[PDB]
Amino acid sequence: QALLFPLCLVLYTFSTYIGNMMIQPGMLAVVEQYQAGIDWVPTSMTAYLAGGMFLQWLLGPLSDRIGRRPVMLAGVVWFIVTCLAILLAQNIEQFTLLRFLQGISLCFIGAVGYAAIQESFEEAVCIKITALMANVELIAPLLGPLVGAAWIHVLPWEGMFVLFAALAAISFFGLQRAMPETATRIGEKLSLKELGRDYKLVLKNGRFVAGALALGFVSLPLLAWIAQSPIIIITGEQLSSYEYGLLQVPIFGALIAGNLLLARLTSRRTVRSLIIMGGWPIMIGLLVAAAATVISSHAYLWMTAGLSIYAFGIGLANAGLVRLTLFASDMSKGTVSAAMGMLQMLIFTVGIEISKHAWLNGGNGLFNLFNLVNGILWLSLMVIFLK
Ligand SMILES: CCCCCCCCCCCC[N+](C)(C)[O-]
Ligand SMILES: [Pr+3]
Q: If you measure from the C-alpha of residue 198 to the centroid of ligand 2, how many angstroms do you get, rounded to a whole number?
């Protein structure tokens, strides 16, 4: 009867992903209008990322302290505001600011949004909702840059920010009068000292952190592409929206196929084996990705095909290694997730920034090398993590 409330959060989830996945393809348009250089294309994703790891930590225990409903709304409100208030910044210097504060609307999906389902809805109810909100995080980056390439053709870029403010409203007016709250730390002290100290406790876990990083480093070459896949292909390789959008699928369609097997071979195998099981393609992906752009700098096909091996592997391994890294520290679920979020993004954010220059002053070579760099990193944190 009240399954309309999960779907509202499903939508808010949906919008925040495409609100980054439809934007990166159409960032070129925005750069060639605000004027700065194609080096600002990825730097969209970057500022969108670096916002999510601002109050990531503080929103969890915070949405506990003063209700889940008013803080959640303060986010859906915060989203739609800066979804239309960025249309009236018009300069690239401060497009960032409004892109960055659109990225803080990311802590709201997990530290309170996801937490509201873990508090109210029960186990088997939570399963099918999370099985859903995992496909949102898979389909909205898969098919987003595909609508984001069929949106800059029939309309301008501006049409997206209206469409998101409105879709976040289709959820918001469905959450205006249909959002019950279940925060139990109402009327509690402004205890700020306790967070840092307790996050430093999961920071002291050389098995957890080294495992939390390895999650970042591994999933980075995936996000480093997404942020740079336009200016790699559109301006870098000089290809159209149907051709560049064609190359998003063989990659993603391989990530989906690795999430197909994972959920099927979760049974006949141990979690421990799966990571090493999905590791070989990851090794071979980033292996051959860059082992392509060795002498041939512009065989993007084999790079995209290499990021299809690597992609298949992230579906299996990366996903498994999530849980073990939650349970690598026998501590709170809220503190570990926030700790591994704020770590993964720090890898993502600052990883891309390095990934960017990697592409400029090096071209495609350096870039893929500063990909396999991360496969090496992750693997190097596996010789630690298991054996
Ligand atoms: C922020 C990028 C999320 C979409 C990419 C899907 C691959 C799984 C990455 C795991 C971390 C994602 N998250 C938001 C649950 O922390
Ligand atoms: Pr505590």
A: 6
Technique used to solve these coordinates? X-ray
Distance 63 CA to ligand 2 centre (A): 15
Measured from the Cα of 109, ligand 1's closest atom is 14
Buried b (16+ CB within 10 A) or exposed e, 312-324: bbbbbbbbbbbeb
> Which residue in this structure is represented by tokens 């290694």?
321
Two tokens at 81?
A: 């505001």
Pick the residue whose CA is nearest to atom 3 on ligand 1.
Answer: 137
Residue carrying the six token digits 């409330």: 5
Q: Which of 82, 111, 94, 75 is nearest to 36 (CA)?
A: 94
Any ligand 1 atom below 6 A from CB of 181: no
**Phi, psi angle pair for 249, to nearest 5°:** -70, -55
Pairwise CA distance, residues 148 & 60, whole Å: 32
E strand map for 13-141? none
Q: Under a CB-based contact definition with an 8 Å cutoff, are residues 49 and 345 in contact? A: yes
Query: Ligand 1, from 45, 56, 137, 323: best to mutate by most atoms within 8 Å of Cβ?
Result: 137
Q: What is the resolution of this structure in A?
A: 3.0
Burial 25-44 (b: 16+ CB within 10 A, else e): bbbbebbeeeebebebbbbb
Rounded Cα–Cα distance for residues 3 and 121 (Å): 10
Rounded to whole angstroms, the Cα distance separating 229 from 244 reads 8
Protein residue with least CA distance to atom 13, ligand 1: 341
Q: Locate the ligand 1 atom nearest the alpha carbon of residue 215 and give its number.
A: 10
Q: How far is the CA of 78 from the centre of ligand 2 (A)?
A: 28
